[PDB]
């Protein structure tokens, strides 16, 4: 008889999206990337595996002003029915009258290995 000890799948490291307007403040400090891991039922992991990545993490910080502020990162895209594990979930964002922000966006691409016959 087979046995399974639940299931888990890492969604990867997501881009930290900060929602703001360019008439308010500019980004001095923030978090670069956060990792989201999902554990839970094998069945659900299979269902989600049919859909290509559409999950994103973002926070609306149009209320935040000068100084550094920490907020909890909100989740969207993936069905948060499973156990949602996150690496840092509290992010530090410093908003200050605009200067000159640069975008350090790391896209990154995954590869689906599983076919056991590479050679």
UniProtKB/TrEMBL annotation:
Keywords: Membrane, Transmembrane, Transmembrane helix
UniProt keyword Secreted present: no
Keyword Transmembrane helix: yes
Top-level taxon of origin: Bacteria
Name the UniProt record assigns to this protein: BH0266 protein
Organism: Halalkalibacterium halodurans (strain ATCC BAA-125 / DSM 18197 / FERM 7344 / JCM 9153 / C-125) (Bacillus halodurans)
């Amino acid at each position: 008889m087979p046995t399974f000890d639940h299931g888990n799948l890492s969604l990867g490291e997501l881009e930290l999206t900060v929602l703001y307007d360019e008439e308010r403040y500019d980004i001095v400090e923030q978090t670069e990337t956060v990792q989201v891991d999902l554990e839970g039922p094998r069945g659900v992991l299979t269902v989600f595996r049919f859909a290509r990545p559409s999950y994103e993490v973002f926070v609306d910080l149009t209320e935040a002003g000068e100084g550094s502020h920490t907020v909890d990162v909100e989740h969207r895209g993936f069905p948060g029915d499973l156990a949602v594990t996150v690496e840092p979930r509290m992010a530090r964002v410093q908003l200050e009258e605009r200067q000159t922000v640069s975008v350090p966006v790391t896209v990154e691409m995954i590869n689906l290995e599983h076919h056991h016959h590479h050679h």
